[PDB]
Amino acid sequence: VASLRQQVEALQGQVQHLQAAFSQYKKVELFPNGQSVGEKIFKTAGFVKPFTEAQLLCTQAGGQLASPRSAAENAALQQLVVAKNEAAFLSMTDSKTEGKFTYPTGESLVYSNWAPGEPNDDGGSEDCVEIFTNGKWNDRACGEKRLVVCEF
Amino acid sequence: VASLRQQVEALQGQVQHLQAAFSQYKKVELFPNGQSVGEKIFKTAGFVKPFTEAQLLCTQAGGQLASPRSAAENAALQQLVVAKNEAAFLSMTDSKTEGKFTYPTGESLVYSNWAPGEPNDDGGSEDCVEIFTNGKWNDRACGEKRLVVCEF
Amino acid sequence: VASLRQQVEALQGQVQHLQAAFSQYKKVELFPNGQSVGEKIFKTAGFVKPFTEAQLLCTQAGGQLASPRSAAENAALQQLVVAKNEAAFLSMTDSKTEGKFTYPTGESLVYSNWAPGEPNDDGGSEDCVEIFTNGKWNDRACGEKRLVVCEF
Numbered sequence: 001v002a003s004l005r006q007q008v009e010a011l012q013g014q015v016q017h018l019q020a021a022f023s024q025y026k027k028v029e030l031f032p033n034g035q036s037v038g039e040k041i042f043k044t045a046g047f048v049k050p051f052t053e054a055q056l057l058c059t060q061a062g063g064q065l066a067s068p069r070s071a072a073e074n075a076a077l078q079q080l081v082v083a084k085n086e087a088a089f090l091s092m093t094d095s096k097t098e099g100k101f102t103y104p105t106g107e108s109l110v111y112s113n114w115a116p117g118e119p120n121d122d123g124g125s126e127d128c129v130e131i132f133t134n135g136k137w138n139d140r141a142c143g144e145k146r147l148v149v150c151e152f
Numbered sequence: 153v154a155s156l157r158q159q160v161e162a163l164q165g166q167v168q169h170l171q172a173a174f175s176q177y178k179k180v181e182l183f184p185n186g187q188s189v190g191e192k193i194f195k196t197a198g199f200v201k202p203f204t205e206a207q208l209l210c211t212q213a214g215g216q217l218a219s220p221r222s223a224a225e226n227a228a229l230q231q232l233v234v235a236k237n238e239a240a241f242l243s244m245t246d247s248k249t250e251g252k253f254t255y256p257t258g259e260s261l262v263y264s265n266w267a268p269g270e271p272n273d274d275g276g277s278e279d280c281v282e283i284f285t286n287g288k289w290n291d292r293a294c295g296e297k298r299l300v301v302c303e304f
Numbered sequence: 305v306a307s308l309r310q311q312v313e314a315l316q317g318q319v320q321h322l323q324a325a326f327s328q329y330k331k332v333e334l335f336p337n338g339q340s341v342g343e344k345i346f347k348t349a350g351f352v353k354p355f356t357e358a359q360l361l362c363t364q365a366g367g368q369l370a371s372p373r374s375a376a377e378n379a380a381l382q383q384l385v386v387a388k389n390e391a392a393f394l395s396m397t398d399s400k401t402e403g404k405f406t407y408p409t410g411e412s413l414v415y416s417n418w419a420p421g422e423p424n425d426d427g428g429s430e431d432c433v434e435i436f437t438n439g440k441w442n443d444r445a446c447g448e449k450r451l452v453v454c455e456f
């Protein structure tokens with residue numbers, strides 16, 4: 001009765017403390033390699049790797065390569081690319097069917113931000129996608145090394 | 153009443169497990185680029201930038217440049233400077249009124265740890281402040297590049 | 305009473321939110337320098353240091369040097385070492401009594417994964433332990449520099 005009321009106030013204090021502490025912790029974690037947008041979080045590893053290796057790193061970490069699905073997400077991702085001044089790989093490829101880019105699941109793109117003239121499968125060997133510091137996309141050979149950015 | 157008790161008992165167990173997990177992840181987070189002191193957390197980006205750019209990075213991240221307000225805070229900040237072996241910028245400047253250093257809010261300093269002979273406005277143009285590996289402060293030209301350390 | 309009911313229900317909602325948000329941040333934190341195994345978390349500083357320096361870094365951060373106590377923990381640590389491609393120091397040494405490796409607490413090893421013929425106290429001066437990218441252990445001079453990996 002009167003006891004439960006006291007225990008509740010104690011619990012209330014514990015939760016409010018956690019909310020304040022967690023909020024501060026989130027800001028700390030995201031500085032300087034992460035960006036939060038909606039319920040998605042982009043985070044860069046800070047180094048470059050070929051597509052296959054970059055892809056494995058994200059999947060093993062429980063996430064996947066950056067997959068911007070809107071202008072808002074693309075802008076958030078662009079911030080990390082600008083901050084590191086290094087173009088990054090996206091998760092999408094047209095390795096299965098040339099000319100048709102898809103997400104790792106197989107789904108067709110729901111949003112794109114291709115630079116003028118892209119994708120152009122230059123040299124007949126560009127199945128991966130990179131995002132420039134200006135936010136635009138370009139298909140690029142998967143063997144090339146680009147900034148690793150995963151989404152969680 | 154009775155059901156409410158077990159409900160409170162259960163929820164608190166969950167909150168305390170969350171507290172324990174959060175405490176562990178906070179220690180992990182701070183290693184090796186952060187330092188906690190009181191309710192404040194200092195975290196370095198690991199690279200150098202001129203004052204204006206450094207200031208923007210911290211503000212955009214939801215914090216501000218390191219602003220040690222006591223010997224204890226200065227000591228905590230010093231650890232990061234020593235770890236990176238790179239002097240860092242503080243948030244304070246005397247741009248508005250020469251010789252009068254203030255925090256971003258305009259408030260006058262409540263603590264200082266100037267090195268002997270400082271501040272001296274060398275060349276007649278040193279309005280920013282840097283902290284050395286020995287913990288002492290020195291006014292420095294804002295255009296120079298120093299370690300970026302923010303506080304949250 | 306009905307008020308306490310509402311309060312308890314309110315807390316349940318706040319806790320569910322924290323649980324979900326924290327779960328996401330745990331994954332974010334561990335990328336790309338951490339590894340979780342059981343209730344233990346290994347995290348690398350990303351650089352090399354001699355044993356004494358490495359040990360101090362971990363202890364001051366509230367943890368200790370990597371101390372795999374099972375094949376499962378050793379495999380998890382190995383994943384991290386492979387990712388960084390740099391042999392790392394473990395916490396154990398036989399500095400007190402030659403030939404008898406112990407944890408920082410003085411307790412004898414409960415698990416080991418020595419490479420064939422090791423430990424061999426090569427040159428009569430190897431009291432520290434390093435873990436290779438293949439997961440095997442080798443006693444090594446404490447003065448040498450190895451990847452710093454702490455456990456929390």
Ligand SMILES: OC[C@H]1O[C@@H](O)[C@H](O)[C@@H](O)[C@H]1O
Pocket residue numbers: 118120122126138139140
């Ligand atoms: O390697 C340079 C080339 O890379 C291609 O991906 C691009 O479509 C070309 O316009 C050119 O920039």
Ligand SMILES: OC[C@H]1O[C@@H](O)[C@H](O)[C@@H](O)[C@H]1O
Pocket residue numbers: 270272274278290291292
């Ligand atoms: O650039 C070197 C100079 O930097 C000034 O900030 C300092 O006051 C001088 O004593 C000298 O060290």
Ligand SMILES: OC[C@H]1O[C@@H](O)[C@H](O)[C@@H](O)[C@H]1O
Pocket residue numbers: 422424426430442443444
């Ligand atoms: O420094 C090279 C040597 O290092 C020792 O620790 C090892 O036992 C030897 O087999 C040899 O590899």
Ligand SMILES: [Ca+2]
Pocket residue numbers: 094095098124125126127
């Ligand atoms: Ca193709």
Ligand SMILES: [Ca+2]
Pocket residue numbers: 094098099121125126127128139
């Ligand atoms: Ca193609």
Ligand SMILES: [Ca+2]
Pocket residue numbers: 118119120121122126138139140
């Ligand atoms: Ca192209």
Ligand SMILES: [Ca+2]
Pocket residue numbers: 028029180181332333
């Ligand atoms: Ca972190």
Ligand SMILES: [Ca+2]
Pocket residue numbers: 246247250276277278279
């Ligand atoms: Ca001035």
Ligand SMILES: [Ca+2]
Pocket residue numbers: 246250251273277278279280291
């Ligand atoms: Ca001045």
Ligand SMILES: [Ca+2]
Pocket residue numbers: 270271272273274278290291292
């Ligand atoms: Ca000066």
Ligand SMILES: [Ca+2]
Pocket residue numbers: 398399402428429430431
């Ligand atoms: Ca010995």
Ligand SMILES: [Ca+2]
Pocket residue numbers: 398402403425429430431432443
């Ligand atoms: Ca020995």
Ligand SMILES: [Ca+2]
Pocket residue numbers: 422423424425426430442443444
């Ligand atoms: Ca040996």
